[PDB]
Amino acid sequence: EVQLVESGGGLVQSGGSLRLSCAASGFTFSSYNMNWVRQAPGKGLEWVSYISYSSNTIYYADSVKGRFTVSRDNAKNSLYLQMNSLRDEDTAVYYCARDGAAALFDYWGQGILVTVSSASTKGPSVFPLAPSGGTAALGCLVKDYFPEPVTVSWNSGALTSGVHTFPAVLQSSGLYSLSSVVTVPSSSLGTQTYICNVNHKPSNTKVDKKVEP
Amino acid sequence: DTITLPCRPAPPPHCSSNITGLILTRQGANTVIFRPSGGDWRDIARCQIAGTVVSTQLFLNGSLAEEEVVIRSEDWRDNAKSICVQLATSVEIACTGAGHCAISRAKWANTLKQIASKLREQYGAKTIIFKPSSGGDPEFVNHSFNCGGEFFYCASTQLFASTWF
Amino acid sequence: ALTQPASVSGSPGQSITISCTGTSSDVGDYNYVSWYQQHPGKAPKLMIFEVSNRPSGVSNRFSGSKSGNTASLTISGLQTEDEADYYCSSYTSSSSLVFGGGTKLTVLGQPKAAPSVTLFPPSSEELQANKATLVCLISDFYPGAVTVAWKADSSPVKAGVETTTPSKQSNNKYAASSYLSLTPEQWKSHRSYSCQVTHEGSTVEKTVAPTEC
Ligand SMILES: *[C@@H]1O[C@H](CO)[C@@H](O)[C@H](O)[C@H]1NC(C)=O
Ligand SMILES: *[C@@H]1O[C@H](CO)[C@@H](O)[C@H](O)[C@H]1NC(C)=O
């Protein structure tokens, strides 16, 4: 049975070098042409590159052109993509596709993640988001941390109902930022103290931020 | 019952060969039309199924496929890229020296059938047509082949002219 | 080059069609047109190739068609397994493999819900650190597909926006977040800021004025 299994991926620094590998089995690897595709987390498919069975017809995308280089080795039934001078814009899941002629692409590899960031490790910076149907919403913004993950609780776990911890967005600098809101009685603001507990193991950090209207 | 290809000049009896592979070009309904490729010597050299003899359109004395016909192309969607066709059973062509070489008709029809099957499994369930060469130079318009240092030329029309569903 | 609807919805048992539009390049040049299904965190799977053909094994509920500049993928008798992203692919005029913008198919097993939006202005803490961040938080929306815009008084806001993709809550609804990063100066400059979330054609719009502390 046709099987494409990819290797490589991980963290790379803005300007580094990563070589993704794709092993094929279950068909004459030397007969089919091949393709590399990529997909940015929460975006669509973008054809990256094409490589012929003879490796004499290679084609690239306008973006990756000059920086990426495809190759293959029929002796090992392997396809390879070399990514150099990596930008943060090249962070994506890379797929190994087989050319299907009129079918375009027919078989795909499982995909491997490649994250290009320059950040190292920094602890979360926590800010209060204070409030102002007889309810209040008070939150904590956790900004400028790397890498994932952070975890967020309220009043050390006492407050479970009403909590909503949003996922993070990776900003254009390799640093993560997320939010955590909680909806409380408008009357409790002048009484019940609200603290958000932000834990970030990478930096062996835990911050308890007090949020006041 | 056989197919008699003209050949000028008369190929000696000893140049009788085995056909092992082909090269084809795809022309510009579910009907796809293929011709015997009239490209330069580069495509032939780079098919690498050519084998031993210096021939056009057909490959003689070359290496056979393992089980079934295998076709290869550097881009099936770029008409300008030839398709190298490799057979599993060879087609013996025996030249008589009377200026023509003989092929089994049934044998060639079965070969064409299998090629069409493999072509369908690439472009889809269409109608595979084979037509004669597109012209160009007398080099590749005819089935050329070198034997003992002499470059003979044969006509390909009778081979490259059928339709398959 | 190929435009698809961002999101399509339907009930179990119904049929739905997904479009893929273009012009003299892709769907208007050759019959190389394919539809791929993608489940969360899995690889694309070929569902339809060459406009209409179906790989063996795929259910006969998937069908494809083409009408010049519009390819179309129809699904009959919707089931949960159908709920996924779908991509069309084609071969361009100038030998370039192009994918569609992707389209989310949701199998409606819950009532549609307007997004709830909560908009927090920069905190005094963040301002004193010489930064400004507006936090827009959207939650409890189904289908999980929205678009966020930012306005200042009235004029649209170009740069400074980072938005997440919808993430499924525990209650089968979706949530997402937008962050507008400004300087304290431009924050205090404008008279109002608006976060506008568009879902199922409708729009909710929350406002914050720098005047209010
Ligand atoms: C073709 O191949 C068969 C099988 O090896 C061989 O017996 C036959 O003599 C060959 N004929 C020519 C003309 O090479
Ligand atoms: C093909 O092989 C046969 C058998 O060995 C040989 O007689 C013939 O000359 C070969 N063809 C050439 C050299 O063109």
Burial degree of B65 (CB within 10 A; 0-12, 13-18, 19+): middle
Position in ligand 2 atom list of the atom nearest CA B147: 14
What sign has the CA pseudo-torsion B163, B101, B26, A69? positive
In angstroms, rounded to a whole number, what is the distance separating the alpha carbons of residues B53 and B20?
11
SS3 for C85-148 is EEEEEEECCCCCEEEECCEEEEECCCCCECCEEEEECCCHHHHHCCCEEEEEEEEEEECCCCEE
Smallest Cα–Cα separation from C65: which of C27, C96, C92, C15? C27
Ligand 1 near B150 CB (within 6 A)? no
Q: How many whole angstroms from B98 Cα to the centroid of ligand 1?
A: 21
| Type of residue found at B104 | S
For chain C, the structural domain boundaries read 7-107, 116-208
Report the 10 Å Cβ neighbour count for C202.
10
Beta strands in A52-175 (DSSP E): 58-60, 68-73, 78-84, 92-99, 105-108, 112-116, 125-129, 135-145, 150-154, 163-165, 169-170
Partner-chain contact C32 A178, CB within 8 Å: no
C-alpha B86/C-alpha B165 separation (Å) is 21
Place of tokens 């510009």: B28
Which ligand is closest in space to the CA of residue B11?
A: 2
Burial of residue C115, with CB atoms counted within 10 A of its CB: 0-12 exposed, 13-18 middle, 19 or more buried? buried
Comparing CB atoms, the residue among A107, A172, A179 nearest residue C135 is A179
Query: In Å, what is the CA distance from C24 to each residue of A135, C27, C65, C94?
Result: 56, 7, 17, 11
A44: containing domain: 3-116
Residue with CA closest to ligand 1 atom 10: B18
d(CA A186, CA A136): 5
Q: Using an 8 Å Cβ cutoff, are A30 and A51 in contact?
A: no
Instruction: Return the H-helix or E-strand segment holding B140.
Output: helix B138-141
A38: nearest Cα among A29, A25, A27, A47: A47
Domain over C116-208 is classified CATH 2.60.40.10: yes
**Chain C: residue whose CA lies nearest to B78:** C95
Report the residue numbers after which chain C has a gap, meaning the C atom sits over 2.5 angstroms from the next written residue's N, or none.
Answer: none
∠ CA B114-B118-B122 to the nearest 5 degrees? 160
At B108, phi and psi to the nearest 5?
-65, -35
Technique used by the depositors? X-ray
Tell me which amino acid residue B165 is.
Answer: F
What long-range pairs does C130-133 form, CB within 8 A, spacing at least 24?
C130/C183, C130/C184, C131/C181, C131/C183, C131/C184, C132/C181, C132/C182, C132/C183, C132/C184, C132/C186, C132/C187, C133/A127, C133/A141, C133/A143, C133/C179, C133/C180, C133/C181, C133/C182
Asked if C34 and C49 count as a contact pair (C-beta separation under 8 A), the reply is yes
- Asked if A80 and A74 touch (Cβ cutoff 8 Å), the reply is no
Contacts of A56 in chain B (CB under 8 A): 46, 74
Please, are residues A108 and A96 in contact by the beta-carbon 8 Å criterion? yes
In degrees and rounded to multiples of 5, residue C98 shows phi and psi of -125, 130
Q: Are A10 and A90 members of one domain? A: yes
Whether residue B46 and residue A54 make contact (CB cut-off 8 A), yes or no, is: yes
- Which residues in chain C touch residue A167, judged by CB atoms under 8 angstroms apart? 164, 167, 177
Q: Please say whether the beta carbons of A106 and B127 come within 8 A.
A: no
Please work out whether the CB of residue B17 comes within 6 Å of at least one atom of ligand 1. Answer: yes
Cα–Cα distance, A96 to A84 (Å, whole number):
18
What's the reported resolution, in angstroms, to a tenth?
Answer: 2.7
- Residue B80 CA, distance from chain mean position: 17
Integer Cα distance of C121 and C100 in angstroms = 37
> Which tokens go with C46?
């070929």
Q: Which of B162, B157, B126, B128 is nearest to B143 (CA)?
A: B157
How many CB atoms within 10 Å of residue C186? 13
Rounded distance, CA A1 to CA B101, Å? 44
Q: Give the closest residue to B160 by CA, choosing from B46, B59, B33.
A: B33
Count: domains in chain A: 2
CATH of domain C7-107: 2.60.40.10
* Closest by Cα among A144, B85, A167, A198 to C137: A167
Q: Torsion angle of alpha carbons C51, C52, C56, C62, nearest 10°? A: 110
CATH code, A168: 2.60.40.10
Task: Name the domain boundary from A116, A149, A177.
Answer: A116
Candidate from A46, A128, A171 with C-beta closest to C99: A46
The CATH code for residues B2-164 is 2.170.40.20
